[PDB]
Amino acid sequence: NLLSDKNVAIIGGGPVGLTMAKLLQQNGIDVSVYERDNDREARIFGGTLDLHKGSGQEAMKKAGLLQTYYDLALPMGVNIADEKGNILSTKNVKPENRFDNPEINRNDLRAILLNSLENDTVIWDRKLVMLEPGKKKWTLTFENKPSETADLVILANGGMSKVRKFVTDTEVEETGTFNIQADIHQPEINCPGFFQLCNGNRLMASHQGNLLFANPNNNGALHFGISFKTPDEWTQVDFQNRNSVVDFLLKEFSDWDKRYKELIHTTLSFVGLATRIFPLEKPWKSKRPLPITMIGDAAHLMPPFAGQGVNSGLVDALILSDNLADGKFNSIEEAVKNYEQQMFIYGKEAQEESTQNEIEMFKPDFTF
């Protein structure tokens, strides 16, 4: 093993960093995960994730966690609707497709990963702020906590990682769209009309440049997203004030059936975020002081409009761990390089599809 008298620091305990830690730990490699979250019960905001056969599910299979993923995940139909609430198309789960890509809740996935690892693999309340290369080890700086050291740092700390300079100078870019997200609890009570329009399936509608998506059953909460081209005026809506977000959305959704408006009216709080991409446009630095790399959204953040996200990141996990597993290479450096080479190819394919589908969907006359 290349890592024999060494240790690995994974920065970030997302699904990709925790899968990374598991695939390494089952090969006897000494890894820690350093996670900003205060403790393992912190709520992860967001929709559900779906792991695909051939990618995500391969990583889970390699981890021995596939069946656990299946047990906790929920396959779902898809309804496409118009702005008037007409169902244009219903695609139900067929028994033979049940396992293709079942929806799992993000805390549920994290709990599966965390349970899979040895005790104290993950070190909570650790926010990496600085990285410094030493003689033979990285020194790792964490806000108000002891510093630590590692032979190999894997950055897994998501799309907005601030500690990427030693791998690449490339910067995150805005793509021109924007997403507003929210949860509604007791959706059967609080948005009955909309809840009944979803009728146990996911829901998508498209009208005049505004896209609505919803999953009515993320562990009992409805999660919806509203996406659109960033208005040129923007920020001129304040996501801390629910009144200004409501006003903006009721204006944009004036044309839409009352059931969708009710959705907006009953939401307590909204999260706004500009869509971003970390583009795989140019090779990463070949001159590097010590072995360091990136996986997941740290490596290839891309728009979430073709289901590309976590799966390609799980594949990074699989490919990197296989590579670091063997004496197949002469050096950690070579193992990292080979991984980075494959990831550029399937990464860039994914980003091309995200971008392309993003262009496609926000064409004024788009129809699902």
Ligand X SMILES: Cc1cc2nc3c(=O)[nH]c(=O)nc-3n(C[C@H](O)[C@H](O)[C@H](O)COP(=O)(O)OP(=O)(O)OC[C@H]3O[C@@H](n4cnc5c(N)ncnc54)[C@H](O)[C@@H]3O)c2cc1C
The count of chain residues that interact with ligand T1C, using the rule CB under 6 A, is: 17
How deeply is 258 buried, as exposed, middle or buried, from its count of CB atoms within 10 A (0-12, 13-18, 19+)?
Answer: exposed
The answer to whether 157 contacts ligand X (rule: CB under 6 A) is: yes
DSSP sequence for 303-358: -SSSS-HHHHHHHHHHHHHHHHHSSSSS-HHHHHHHHHHHHHHHHHHHHHHHHHHH
Residue 213 interacts with which of ligand X, ligand T1C, none, CB < 5 to 8 Å by class: ligand T1C
Considering the complex, state which of residue 214 and residue 318 has its C-beta at the smaller distance from ligand T1C.
214
Q: What is the DSSP string of 54-105?
A: TTHHHHHHHHT-HHHHHHH-B---EEEE-TT--EEEEEPPPTTTTTSS-EE-
* 309 touches ligand X by CB under 6 A: yes
Q: CB 270 → ligand T1C: shortest distance, Å? A: 12
Binding segment (CB under 6 A) for ligand T1C, from list 58-66, 152-160, 224-232, 320-328:
224-232
Are the beta carbons of 35 and 124 closer than 8 angstroms?
A: yes
Q: Binding partner of residue 16 among ligand T1C, ligand X, none, CB under 5 to 8 Å per kind? A: ligand X
Q: Which residues 6+ apart lie within 8 Å of 334 measured at CB? A: none
Angle 11-16-20 from CA coordinates, rounded to 5°: 75
* Angstrom distances, CA of residue 34 to CA of 17, 74, 172, 360: 9, 30, 23, 38
15: contact with ligand X by CB under 6 A = yes
Q: Is 313 in the site for ligand X (CB under 6 A)?
A: yes
H helices then E strands: how many in the chain?
Answer: 11, 17
First to last CA, the chain: 49
What's the token pair of residue 247?
């006003």
**Contact indicator for 23, 326 with CB cutoff of 8 Å:** no
Select from 195, 213, 253, 362 the one that contacts ligand T1C (CB under 6 A): 213
> Is the CB of residue 131 less than 8 Å from the CB of residue 166?
yes
- Closest CB to ligand X among residues 2, 300: 300
35 is an interface residue for ligand X by CB under 6 A: yes
Query: Using CB distances below 5 to 8 A depending on partner kind, what does residue 316 bind out of ligand T1C, ligand X, none?
Result: none
223 lies in the site for ligand T1C, by CB under 6 A: yes
Please choose, out of 15-23, 59-67, 222-230, 343-351, the segment that lies near ligand T1C by the rule CB under 6 A.
222-230
DSSP lists the bridge partners of residue 178 as 228, 274
Q: Which of 12, 17, 47, 347 binds ligand T1C (CB under 6 A)?
A: 47
Contact call for residue 128 and ligand X (CB under 6 A): yes
Q: Quote the least distance from Cβ 255 to ligand X, whole Å.
A: 24
Selected from 151, 297, 340, 358, the binder of ligand X by CB under 6 A is 297
User: How far, in Å, are 72, 79, 98, 203 from residue 76 at the CA level?
Assistant: 13, 10, 8, 10
Residue 179 or 257: the one with the smaller Cβ distance to ligand X is 179
Query: Rule CB under 6 A: is residue 225 a binding residue for ligand X?
Result: yes
104 lines the binding site for ligand T1C (CB under 6 A) = no
Please name every residue paired with 87 in a beta bridge, in sequence order, or none if there are none: 81
303: closest CA among 163, 173, 154? 173
Distance between CA 102 and CA 93 in Å, rounded? 10
Q: Work out whether 347 is an interface residue with ligand X (CB under 6 A).
A: no
Size of the site for ligand X (CB under 6 A): 31
Between residue 58 and residue 117, which ones bind ligand X under the rule CB under 6 A? none
The torsion angles phi and psi of 98, rounded to 5 degrees, stand at -45, -40
Q: Which stretch binds ligand T1C (CB under 6 A): 106-114, 262-270, 305-313, 315-323?
A: 305-313
Site residues, ligand T1C (CB under 6 A): 47, 179, 202, 204, 213-215, 223-225, 227, 304-307, 357, 361
Q: Which residues are annotated as a binding site for NADPH?
A: 43
Site residues, ligand X (CB under 6 A): 11-17, 34-37, 47, 49-50, 126-128, 156-158, 179, 181, 225, 296-297, 304, 307, 309-311, 313
